[PDB]
Amino acid sequence: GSVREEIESLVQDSLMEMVKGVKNTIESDLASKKGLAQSTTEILQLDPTNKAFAKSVLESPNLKGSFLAIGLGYESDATVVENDDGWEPNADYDPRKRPWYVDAKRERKLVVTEPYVDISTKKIIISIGTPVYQQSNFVGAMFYDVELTQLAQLVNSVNLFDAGYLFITTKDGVTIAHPNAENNGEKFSQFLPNVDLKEGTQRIELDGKYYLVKFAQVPSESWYIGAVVDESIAFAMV
Amino acid sequence: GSVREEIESLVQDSLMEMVKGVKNTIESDLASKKGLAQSTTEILQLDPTNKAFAKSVLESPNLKGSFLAIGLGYESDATVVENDDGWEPNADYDPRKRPWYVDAKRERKLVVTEPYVDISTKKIIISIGTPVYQQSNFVGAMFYDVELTQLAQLVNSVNLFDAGYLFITTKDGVTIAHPNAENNGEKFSQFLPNVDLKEGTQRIELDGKYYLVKFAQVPSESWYIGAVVDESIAFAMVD
Ligand SMILES: [Ca+2]
Ligand SMILES: [Ca+2]
């Protein structure tokens, strides 16, 4: 039917606009933070082992304010030179086995992690990870934590004409932004079953009611943006 | 005339697109460069008179890659540490008399100078200036040179109908972008006389020929984007 295709078209417009909005907030913010993280890393490579220097650099106020927290974890122990005022590394914390560290050591390069559960804030964030070198010798890696607070802002600003909403997931189906924030950190299947994580239009039945779902991908992060509408309500509206 | 008014509407559309482009590409880039310059300054005031430290920092690859050049000028003896492989400051150079220095010194925070056109070429250059302090004492300032290469790309990528083009000036009317870069560094009145630097719409007759001009400002730089068309040719394309 034509009404049904119109709904699909409007969902598509809201989806494309959200894709573009993610790119223009998160990605440009990430691009800027990457150069800062890279330079900071090259500066610490002027005297890598010296914890007192790294500490002074990480507590310089512009840096301290551009990231949730920054830290350097050393190859030769589980100690972290950190700038996080509201956190300290508990008895067990081994930097060498956290994603930012492993990814950085693996790639020998600046990396960006998948969204992940932070030890400190317990919310989901992403990290820039950098290898810290000294004469070809790997001595540690750095994290530069980035809050995903803009995602929650994007998602809570759009209501698909009182029929539905948008949400965001990782490539593995983990929800990182949802109007109901209690859904974050859970697989999106928990609230939207029988939907494939793939781009293109799907119609599902859930408790005798019918929903239309569309996904678009944000390729540089490989996040998925989902748009879901209650088809009955939306049919009545349009 | 609904045709000419449609002309005006189409020129406005392009103008807005160009205002959006300058913010999205040049402002975004400067925002990120100011963050880098602010952090670099704070790091150097861990030990500012250590010229060996300063040099190591300014020569680190990302910093050296992200800017045309960076320099630290000292208040007490007017000496300079810089990373420009093609320039060495002699005693005929006093950084303390330079605009970025004075402005940084006076404002006591990061400043951005007016852009200029290097006379030995047509490169557009702007400088970020930062004050350097030690124990609450002003000990010098830094400059961070940014080349504005995006400007040429932006105006060279747009063609108004084929009836005209867009160009960019400073608040003082100096041309810093134009499809013919020969005009860069010159007052725009050189190729477009009897036009006011003012937001809005103007029509003038030059060489028995009629032109439509619209200007939008880019507020955080106070630059003006100009859009000019041969209005007869535009009239014919709409009709
Ligand atoms: Ca701490
Ligand atoms: Ca030099």
Tab-separated table of C-alpha atoms and ligand atoms in Angstrom:
chain	number	residue	atom	x	y	z
A	1	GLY	CA	0.000	0.000	0.000
A	2	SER	CA	0.950	3.632	-0.526
A	3	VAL	CA	0.470	4.712	3.092
A	4	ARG	CA	2.885	1.985	4.154
A	5	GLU	CA	5.561	3.108	1.685
A	6	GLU	CA	5.137	6.741	2.785
A	7	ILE	CA	5.855	5.682	6.375
A	8	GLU	CA	8.912	3.794	5.178
A	9	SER	CA	10.054	6.922	3.345
A	10	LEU	CA	9.643	9.181	6.397
A	11	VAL	CA	11.483	6.706	8.572
A	12	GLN	CA	14.239	6.721	5.967
A	13	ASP	CA	14.530	10.548	6.112
A	14	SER	CA	14.798	10.485	9.886
A	15	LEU	CA	17.385	7.706	9.667
A	16	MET	CA	19.556	9.527	7.110
A	17	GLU	CA	19.421	12.702	9.162
A	18	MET	CA	20.522	10.783	12.275
A	19	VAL	CA	23.395	9.151	10.326
A	20	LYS	CA	24.575	12.579	9.217
A	21	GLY	CA	24.141	13.938	12.764
A	22	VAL	CA	26.299	11.163	14.264
A	23	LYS	CA	29.031	11.891	11.703
A	24	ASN	CA	28.914	15.630	12.366
A	25	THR	CA	29.077	15.416	16.145
A	26	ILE	CA	30.856	12.204	17.282
A	27	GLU	CA	33.179	11.731	14.284
A	28	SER	CA	34.455	15.288	13.950
A	29	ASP	CA	34.848	15.385	17.719
A	30	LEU	CA	36.791	12.104	17.444
A	31	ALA	CA	38.910	13.480	14.582
A	32	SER	CA	39.951	16.443	16.726
A	33	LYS	CA	40.618	14.278	19.787
A	34	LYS	CA	42.772	11.917	17.718
A	35	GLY	CA	45.309	14.570	16.801
A	36	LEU	CA	45.476	15.709	20.407
A	37	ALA	CA	45.949	12.126	21.589
A	38	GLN	CA	48.637	11.503	18.954
A	39	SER	CA	50.668	14.605	19.909
A	40	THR	CA	50.375	13.963	23.617
A	41	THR	CA	51.714	10.465	22.950
A	42	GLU	CA	54.644	11.774	20.913
A	43	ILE	CA	55.457	14.269	23.669
A	44	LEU	CA	55.470	11.546	26.346
A	45	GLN	CA	57.822	9.626	24.048
A	46	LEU	CA	60.453	12.249	24.878
A	47	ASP	CA	60.787	10.580	28.309
A	48	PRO	CA	58.391	7.552	28.391
A	49	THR	CA	59.368	5.799	31.651
A	50	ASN	CA	59.254	8.958	33.756
A	51	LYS	CA	55.952	8.755	35.627
A	52	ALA	CA	56.349	12.265	37.079
A	53	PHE	CA	56.550	13.862	33.644
A	54	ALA	CA	53.678	11.888	32.109
A	55	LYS	CA	51.724	12.829	35.216
A	56	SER	CA	52.398	16.534	34.761
A	57	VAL	CA	51.387	16.376	31.101
A	58	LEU	CA	48.151	14.506	31.817
A	59	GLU	CA	47.141	16.999	34.515
A	60	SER	CA	47.648	20.055	32.289
A	61	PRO	CA	44.123	21.585	32.253
A	62	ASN	CA	43.238	21.630	28.525
A	63	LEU	CA	44.060	17.913	28.174
A	64	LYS	CA	42.408	17.105	31.488
A	65	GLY	CA	39.280	18.826	30.222
A	66	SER	CA	39.215	17.373	26.679
A	67	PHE	CA	38.764	13.783	27.813
A	68	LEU	CA	36.820	11.899	30.467
A	69	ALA	CA	40.186	10.679	31.729
A	70	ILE	CA	43.640	9.842	30.347
A	71	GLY	CA	46.152	7.281	31.557
A	72	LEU	CA	49.360	5.537	30.714
A	73	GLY	CA	49.801	1.885	31.664
A	74	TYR	CA	53.324	0.463	31.705
A	75	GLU	CA	54.630	-2.757	30.076
A	76	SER	CA	56.679	-3.591	33.189
A	77	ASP	CA	53.908	-3.522	35.784
A	78	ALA	CA	50.198	-2.981	36.239
A	79	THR	CA	50.675	0.637	37.267
A	80	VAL	CA	48.814	3.478	35.626
A	81	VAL	CA	49.714	7.141	35.534
A	82	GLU	CA	46.231	8.649	35.423
A	83	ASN	CA	44.411	12.002	35.642
A	84	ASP	CA	41.077	10.668	36.883
A	85	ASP	CA	40.352	12.416	40.177
A	86	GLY	CA	37.354	10.270	41.026
A	87	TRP	CA	39.053	6.903	40.489
A	88	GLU	CA	42.157	4.943	41.519
A	89	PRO	CA	43.389	1.566	40.220
A	90	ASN	CA	42.123	-1.093	42.661
A	91	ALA	CA	44.354	-3.966	43.859
A	92	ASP	CA	43.750	-5.856	40.661
A	93	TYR	CA	43.817	-3.739	37.547
A	94	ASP	CA	46.094	-4.861	34.754
A	95	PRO	CA	46.246	-2.229	31.965
A	96	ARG	CA	48.045	-4.785	29.800
A	97	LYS	CA	44.783	-6.716	29.422
A	98	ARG	CA	42.292	-3.884	28.716
A	99	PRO	CA	40.961	-3.331	25.144
A	100	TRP	CA	42.658	0.030	24.574
A	101	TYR	CA	46.000	-1.494	25.543
A	102	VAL	CA	45.660	-4.759	23.615
A	103	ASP	CA	44.327	-3.030	20.498
A	104	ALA	CA	47.181	-0.472	20.659
A	105	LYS	CA	49.881	-3.082	21.235
A	106	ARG	CA	48.411	-5.286	18.512
A	107	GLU	CA	48.247	-2.564	15.852
A	108	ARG	CA	51.368	-0.568	16.820
A	109	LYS	CA	49.263	2.482	16.065
A	110	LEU	CA	46.597	4.858	17.293
A	111	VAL	CA	43.388	2.868	17.585
A	112	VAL	CA	39.794	3.523	18.593
A	113	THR	CA	38.072	0.816	20.631
A	114	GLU	CA	34.594	-0.618	20.350
A	115	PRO	CA	32.216	0.939	22.885
A	116	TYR	CA	32.894	-0.740	26.258
A	117	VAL	CA	32.008	-0.763	29.931
A	118	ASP	CA	34.294	1.685	31.763
A	119	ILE	CA	35.873	0.546	35.058
A	120	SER	CA	35.395	3.988	36.603
A	121	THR	CA	32.050	5.436	35.525
A	122	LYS	CA	30.555	2.012	34.673
A	123	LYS	CA	28.871	3.683	31.697
A	124	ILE	CA	29.743	2.724	28.115
A	125	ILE	CA	32.386	4.826	26.398
A	126	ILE	CA	35.017	4.539	23.705
A	127	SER	CA	38.752	4.984	23.997
A	128	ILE	CA	41.550	6.232	21.849
A	129	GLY	CA	44.466	3.884	22.440
A	130	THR	CA	48.061	4.669	21.575
A	131	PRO	CA	51.246	2.610	21.746
A	132	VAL	CA	53.991	4.272	23.843
A	133	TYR	CA	57.412	3.569	22.349
A	134	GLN	CA	61.061	4.002	23.224
A	135	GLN	CA	63.649	3.005	20.638
A	136	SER	CA	61.357	0.401	19.019
A	137	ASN	CA	60.703	-0.950	22.534
A	138	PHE	CA	57.058	-1.192	23.557
A	139	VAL	CA	56.845	0.252	27.053
A	140	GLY	CA	53.125	0.859	27.436
A	141	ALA	CA	49.928	2.169	25.945
A	142	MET	CA	47.603	5.042	26.620
A	143	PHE	CA	43.880	5.433	26.904
A	144	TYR	CA	41.990	8.635	26.152
A	145	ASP	CA	38.440	8.127	27.313
A	146	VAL	CA	35.586	9.748	25.397
A	147	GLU	CA	32.031	9.972	26.773
A	148	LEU	CA	29.213	9.051	24.337
A	149	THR	CA	26.883	11.662	25.794
A	150	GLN	CA	26.091	13.209	22.397
A	151	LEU	CA	24.539	9.885	21.285
A	152	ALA	CA	22.000	9.953	24.090
A	153	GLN	CA	21.305	13.570	23.126
A	154	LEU	CA	20.704	12.750	19.456
A	155	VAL	CA	18.388	9.864	20.284
A	156	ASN	CA	16.330	11.774	22.872
A	157	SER	CA	15.771	14.626	20.440
A	158	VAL	CA	13.901	12.623	17.824
A	159	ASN	CA	10.399	11.181	18.029
A	160	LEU	CA	9.174	9.444	14.865
A	161	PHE	CA	5.830	11.316	14.797
A	162	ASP	CA	4.736	9.806	18.142
A	163	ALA	CA	4.889	6.334	16.569
A	164	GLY	CA	8.440	5.331	17.468
A	165	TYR	CA	12.056	6.294	17.962
A	166	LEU	CA	15.648	5.747	16.990
A	167	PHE	CA	18.359	3.862	18.840
A	168	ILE	CA	22.031	3.024	18.188
A	169	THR	CA	23.976	-0.245	18.475
A	170	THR	CA	27.435	-1.674	17.981
A	171	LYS	CA	28.227	-4.041	15.128
A	172	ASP	CA	27.600	-6.832	17.633
A	173	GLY	CA	24.080	-5.677	18.514
A	174	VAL	CA	24.896	-3.978	21.802
A	175	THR	CA	22.706	-0.957	22.460
A	176	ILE	CA	24.660	2.208	23.207
A	177	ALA	CA	21.918	4.802	22.840
A	178	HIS	CA	18.201	4.427	23.518
A	179	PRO	CA	15.380	6.740	24.735
A	180	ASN	CA	15.131	4.270	27.605
A	181	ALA	CA	18.758	4.331	28.784
A	182	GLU	CA	18.172	1.159	30.827
A	183	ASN	CA	18.473	-0.631	27.490
A	184	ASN	CA	22.128	0.378	27.027
A	185	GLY	CA	24.692	-2.383	27.366
A	186	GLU	CA	22.115	-5.016	26.451
A	187	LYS	CA	21.662	-6.690	23.076
A	188	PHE	CA	18.923	-4.871	21.152
A	189	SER	CA	17.148	-8.247	20.627
A	190	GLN	CA	15.933	-8.011	24.225
A	191	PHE	CA	13.477	-5.289	23.228
A	192	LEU	CA	13.328	-5.892	19.451
A	193	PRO	CA	13.363	-9.655	18.681
A	194	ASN	CA	13.277	-11.261	15.204
A	195	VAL	CA	15.126	-8.319	13.666
A	196	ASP	CA	18.393	-8.848	11.780
A	197	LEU	CA	21.250	-6.398	12.273
A	198	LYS	CA	21.370	-5.420	8.644
A	199	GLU	CA	20.481	-2.445	6.533
A	200	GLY	CA	17.111	-2.418	4.805
A	201	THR	CA	13.439	-2.505	5.805
A	202	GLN	CA	12.041	-5.228	8.086
A	203	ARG	CA	8.526	-5.758	9.370
A	204	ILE	CA	8.001	-7.733	12.520
A	205	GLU	CA	5.205	-8.890	14.702
A	206	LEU	CA	5.664	-8.416	18.407
A	207	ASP	CA	2.823	-9.417	20.725
A	208	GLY	CA	0.292	-9.351	17.926
A	209	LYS	CA	1.366	-5.836	16.950
A	210	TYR	CA	3.324	-4.822	13.871
A	211	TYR	CA	6.532	-2.836	13.731
A	212	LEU	CA	8.641	-1.433	10.921
A	213	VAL	CA	12.418	-1.324	11.517
A	214	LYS	CA	15.152	0.220	9.441
A	215	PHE	CA	18.898	0.164	10.015
A	216	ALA	CA	21.669	2.281	8.537
A	217	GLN	CA	25.304	1.836	9.373
A	218	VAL	CA	27.875	4.416	10.474
A	219	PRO	CA	30.792	2.853	8.622
A	220	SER	CA	33.827	4.485	10.311
A	221	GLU	CA	32.627	3.184	13.684
A	222	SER	CA	30.524	0.357	12.269
A	223	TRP	CA	27.669	1.356	14.537
A	224	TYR	CA	24.106	0.681	13.447
A	225	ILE	CA	21.377	3.279	13.707
A	226	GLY	CA	17.945	1.774	14.081
A	227	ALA	CA	14.556	3.347	13.533
A	228	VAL	CA	11.462	1.538	14.751
A	229	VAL	CA	7.794	2.555	14.423
A	230	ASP	CA	4.539	1.105	15.649
A	231	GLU	CA	2.924	0.574	12.246
A	232	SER	CA	-0.683	0.848	13.390
A	233	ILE	CA	-0.209	4.214	15.146
A	234	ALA	CA	1.919	5.588	12.297
A	235	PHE	CA	-0.629	4.444	9.723
A	236	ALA	CA	-3.320	6.405	11.574
A	237	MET	CA	-1.041	9.470	11.865
A	238	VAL	CA	-0.186	9.549	8.163
B	1	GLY	CA	10.123	40.516	-11.337
B	2	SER	CA	9.570	36.946	-10.147
B	3	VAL	CA	12.472	35.820	-12.337
B	4	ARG	CA	15.020	38.188	-10.800
B	5	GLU	CA	13.628	37.400	-7.357
B	6	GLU	CA	14.220	33.730	-8.188
B	7	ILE	CA	17.749	34.695	-9.235
B	8	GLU	CA	18.164	36.238	-5.819
B	9	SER	CA	16.832	33.073	-4.170
B	10	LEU	CA	19.207	30.742	-6.013
B	11	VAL	CA	22.227	32.930	-5.267
B	12	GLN	CA	21.171	32.999	-1.604
B	13	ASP	CA	20.949	29.200	-1.622
B	14	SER	CA	24.520	28.874	-2.861
B	15	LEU	CA	25.743	31.556	-0.428
B	16	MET	CA	24.255	29.667	2.541
B	17	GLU	CA	25.815	26.461	1.306
B	18	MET	CA	29.180	28.245	1.187
B	19	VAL	CA	28.715	29.693	4.697
B	20	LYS	CA	27.926	26.151	5.845
B	21	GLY	CA	31.026	24.834	4.028
B	22	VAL	CA	33.430	27.326	5.623
B	23	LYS	CA	32.153	26.459	9.121
B	24	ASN	CA	32.176	22.709	8.446
B	25	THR	CA	35.689	22.602	7.020
B	26	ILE	CA	37.760	25.628	8.081
B	27	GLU	CA	36.178	26.447	11.447
B	28	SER	CA	36.135	22.805	12.485
B	29	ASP	CA	39.792	22.505	11.550
B	30	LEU	CA	40.706	25.717	13.482
B	31	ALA	CA	38.735	24.518	16.510
B	32	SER	CA	40.855	21.373	16.594
B	33	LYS	CA	44.067	23.305	15.988
B	34	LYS	CA	43.308	25.698	18.870
B	35	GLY	CA	42.901	22.689	21.173
B	36	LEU	CA	46.258	21.390	20.029
B	37	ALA	CA	47.922	24.802	20.429
B	38	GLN	CA	46.408	25.379	23.889
B	39	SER	CA	47.608	21.975	25.137
B	40	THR	CA	51.056	22.438	23.609
B	41	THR	CA	51.340	25.784	25.374
B	42	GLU	CA	50.301	24.346	28.732
B	43	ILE	CA	52.800	21.541	28.342
B	44	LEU	CA	55.628	23.950	27.536
B	45	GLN	CA	54.953	25.929	30.690
B	46	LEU	CA	55.965	22.829	32.631
B	47	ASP	CA	59.448	24.286	31.918
B	48	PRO	CA	59.275	27.268	29.461
B	49	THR	CA	62.892	28.556	29.459
B	50	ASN	CA	64.196	25.057	28.782
B	51	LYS	CA	64.889	25.667	25.110
B	52	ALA	CA	65.883	22.045	24.538
B	53	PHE	CA	62.524	20.840	25.897
B	54	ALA	CA	60.626	23.380	23.802
B	55	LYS	CA	62.525	22.364	20.669
B	56	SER	CA	61.896	18.644	21.226
B	57	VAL	CA	58.198	19.333	21.560
B	58	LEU	CA	57.867	21.563	18.485
B	59	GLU	CA	59.789	19.056	16.404
B	60	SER	CA	57.637	16.061	17.374
B	61	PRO	CA	56.029	14.789	14.094
B	62	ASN	CA	52.270	15.329	14.633
B	63	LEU	CA	52.796	18.904	15.855
B	64	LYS	CA	55.255	19.670	13.089
B	65	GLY	CA	52.805	18.162	10.582
B	66	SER	CA	49.714	19.949	11.858
B	67	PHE	CA	50.987	23.511	11.437
B	68	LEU	CA	52.921	25.559	8.908
B	69	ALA	CA	55.314	26.527	11.715
B	70	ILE	CA	55.358	27.041	15.504
B	71	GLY	CA	57.545	29.372	17.546
B	72	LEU	CA	58.123	30.515	21.099
B	73	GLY	CA	59.261	34.071	21.639
B	74	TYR	CA	60.765	35.038	24.976
B	75	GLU	CA	59.868	38.252	26.840
B	76	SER	CA	63.212	38.904	28.582
B	77	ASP	CA	65.690	38.544	25.692
B	78	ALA	CA	63.497	38.317	22.567
B	79	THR	CA	64.950	34.955	21.534
B	80	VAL	CA	62.933	32.440	19.562
B	81	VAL	CA	62.611	28.692	19.441
B	82	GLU	CA	60.940	27.527	16.256
B	83	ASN	CA	60.458	24.465	14.047
B	84	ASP	CA	60.609	26.137	10.648
B	85	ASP	CA	63.357	24.393	8.642
B	86	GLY	CA	63.356	27.303	6.207
B	87	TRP	CA	63.647	30.166	8.689
B	88	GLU	CA	66.060	31.319	11.366
B	89	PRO	CA	65.231	34.447	13.403
B	90	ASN	CA	68.041	36.999	13.637
B	91	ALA	CA	68.357	40.024	15.928
B	92	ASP	CA	66.430	42.057	13.339
B	93	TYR	CA	63.405	40.041	14.460
B	94	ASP	CA	61.674	40.969	17.707
B	95	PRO	CA	58.801	38.558	18.354
B	96	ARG	CA	57.498	40.977	21.033
B	97	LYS	CA	56.574	43.499	18.334
B	98	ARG	CA	54.535	40.951	16.347
B	99	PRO	CA	50.681	41.092	16.398
B	100	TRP	CA	50.132	37.538	17.705
B	101	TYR	CA	52.523	38.296	20.589
B	102	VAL	CA	51.056	41.678	21.606
B	103	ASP	CA	47.481	40.345	21.274
B	104	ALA	CA	48.283	37.209	23.316
B	105	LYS	CA	50.131	39.311	25.898
B	106	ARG	CA	47.222	41.762	26.161
B	107	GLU	CA	44.307	39.266	26.154
B	108	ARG	CA	46.146	36.816	28.437
B	109	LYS	CA	44.580	33.863	26.593
B	110	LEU	CA	44.667	32.204	23.180
B	111	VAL	CA	44.153	34.623	20.280
B	112	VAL	CA	43.634	34.200	16.538
B	113	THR	CA	45.076	36.919	14.235
B	114	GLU	CA	43.545	38.256	11.032
B	115	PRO	CA	44.619	36.102	8.096
B	116	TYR	CA	47.125	37.431	5.561
B	117	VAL	CA	48.400	36.596	2.095
B	118	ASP	CA	52.116	35.837	1.952
B	119	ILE	CA	53.404	38.324	-0.645
B	120	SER	CA	56.109	35.898	-1.812
B	121	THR	CA	53.135	33.758	-2.939
B	122	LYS	CA	49.343	33.547	-2.665
B	123	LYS	CA	49.177	31.271	0.366
B	124	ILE	CA	46.626	32.278	2.977
B	125	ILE	CA	48.057	32.184	6.493
B	126	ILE	CA	46.550	32.789	9.907
B	127	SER	CA	48.267	32.580	13.301
B	128	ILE	CA	47.124	31.360	16.677
B	129	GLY	CA	48.848	33.207	19.500
B	130	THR	CA	49.226	31.961	23.057
B	131	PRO	CA	50.672	33.576	26.166
B	132	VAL	CA	53.285	31.639	28.177
B	133	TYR	CA	53.424	31.998	31.949
B	134	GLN	CA	55.787	30.910	34.704
B	135	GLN	CA	54.825	31.361	38.386
B	136	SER	CA	52.090	33.780	37.265
B	137	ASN	CA	54.756	35.673	35.330
B	138	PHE	CA	54.352	36.284	31.596
B	139	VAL	CA	57.541	34.892	30.086
B	140	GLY	CA	56.716	34.980	26.366
B	141	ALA	CA	54.216	34.042	23.703
B	142	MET	CA	53.850	31.433	20.982
B	143	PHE	CA	52.689	31.520	17.388
B	144	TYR	CA	51.073	28.606	15.501
B	145	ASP	CA	50.826	29.184	11.729
B	146	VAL	CA	47.855	27.684	9.922
B	147	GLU	CA	47.607	27.680	6.144
B	148	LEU	CA	44.026	28.135	4.931
B	149	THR	CA	44.187	25.808	1.897
B	150	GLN	CA	40.529	24.874	2.208
B	151	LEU	CA	39.548	28.398	0.989
B	152	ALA	CA	40.811	27.928	-2.585
B	153	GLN	CA	39.154	24.469	-2.836
B	154	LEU	CA	35.822	25.849	-1.641
B	155	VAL	CA	35.452	28.700	-4.130
B	156	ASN	CA	36.975	26.700	-6.984
B	157	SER	CA	34.379	23.966	-6.551
B	158	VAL	CA	31.331	26.161	-7.118
B	159	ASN	CA	30.003	27.819	-10.269
B	160	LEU	CA	26.952	30.088	-10.102
B	161	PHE	CA	25.018	28.995	-13.165
B	162	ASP	CA	27.900	29.817	-15.396
B	163	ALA	CA	26.738	33.332	-14.720
B	164	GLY	CA	29.153	33.992	-11.841
B	165	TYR	CA	31.095	32.820	-8.784
B	166	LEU	CA	31.806	33.137	-5.064
B	167	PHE	CA	34.703	34.789	-3.277
B	168	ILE	CA	35.850	35.452	0.312
B	169	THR	CA	37.198	38.587	2.000
B	170	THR	CA	38.354	39.752	5.398
B	171	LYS	CA	36.334	42.273	7.374
B	172	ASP	CA	38.617	44.932	5.836
B	173	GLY	CA	37.749	43.855	2.266
B	174	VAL	CA	41.041	42.095	1.521
B	175	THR	CA	40.472	39.138	-0.843
B	176	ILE	CA	41.617	35.786	0.546
B	177	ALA	CA	39.823	33.453	-1.869
B	178	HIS	CA	38.778	33.825	-5.522
B	179	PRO	CA	38.628	31.440	-8.525
B	180	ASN	CA	41.341	33.685	-9.948
B	181	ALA	CA	43.953	33.657	-7.167
B	182	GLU	CA	45.653	36.681	-8.771
B	183	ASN	CA	43.053	38.735	-6.844
B	184	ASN	CA	44.056	37.268	-3.457
B	185	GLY	CA	45.689	39.860	-1.193
B	186	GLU	CA	43.910	42.641	-3.066
B	187	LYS	CA	40.833	44.673	-2.090
B	188	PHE	CA	37.782	43.084	-3.695
B	189	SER	CA	36.871	46.482	-5.186
B	190	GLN	CA	39.727	45.857	-7.637
B	191	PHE	CA	37.521	43.379	-9.549
B	192	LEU	CA	34.193	44.453	-8.102
B	193	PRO	CA	34.106	48.242	-7.658
B	194	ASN	CA	31.256	50.296	-6.204
B	195	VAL	CA	30.037	47.462	-4.002
B	196	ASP	CA	29.677	47.784	-0.251
B	197	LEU	CA	31.003	45.209	2.150
B	198	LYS	CA	27.588	44.628	3.712
B	199	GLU	CA	25.324	41.673	4.334
B	200	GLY	CA	22.486	41.817	1.829
B	201	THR	CA	21.806	42.235	-1.881
B	202	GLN	CA	23.263	44.784	-4.322
B	203	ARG	CA	22.913	45.436	-8.055
B	204	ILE	CA	25.499	47.440	-9.984
B	205	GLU	CA	26.368	48.315	-13.574
B	206	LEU	CA	29.971	47.920	-14.697
B	207	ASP	CA	31.207	48.034	-18.299
B	208	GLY	CA	27.602	48.433	-19.454
B	209	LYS	CA	26.950	45.090	-17.745
B	210	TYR	CA	24.668	44.279	-14.836
B	211	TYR	CA	25.640	42.275	-11.780
B	212	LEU	CA	23.911	40.878	-8.725
B	213	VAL	CA	25.943	40.622	-5.502
B	214	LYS	CA	25.037	38.997	-2.193
B	215	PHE	CA	27.257	38.944	0.912
B	216	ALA	CA	27.059	36.707	3.963
B	217	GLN	CA	29.378	37.048	6.941
B	218	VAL	CA	31.146	34.189	8.718
B	219	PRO	CA	30.786	35.641	12.256
B	220	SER	CA	33.492	33.819	14.256
B	221	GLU	CA	36.159	34.977	11.719
B	222	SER	CA	34.287	38.089	10.603
B	223	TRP	CA	34.989	37.053	6.990
B	224	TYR	CA	32.562	37.989	4.214
B	225	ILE	CA	31.492	35.504	1.536
B	226	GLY	CA	30.540	37.228	-1.705
B	227	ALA	CA	28.358	35.794	-4.464
B	228	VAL	CA	28.327	37.645	-7.798
B	229	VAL	CA	26.473	36.919	-11.047
B	230	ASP	CA	26.016	38.495	-14.432
B	231	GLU	CA	22.302	39.129	-13.916
B	232	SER	CA	21.453	39.145	-17.618
B	233	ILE	CA	22.923	35.712	-18.085
B	234	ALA	CA	21.207	34.471	-14.907
B	235	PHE	CA	17.903	35.976	-16.066
B	236	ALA	CA	18.250	33.962	-19.275
B	237	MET	CA	18.993	30.707	-17.446
B	238	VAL	CA	16.007	30.995	-15.127
B	239	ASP	CA	13.843	31.949	-18.100
C	1	CA	CA	43.293	8.984	39.995
C	2	CA	CA	64.525	27.287	11.930
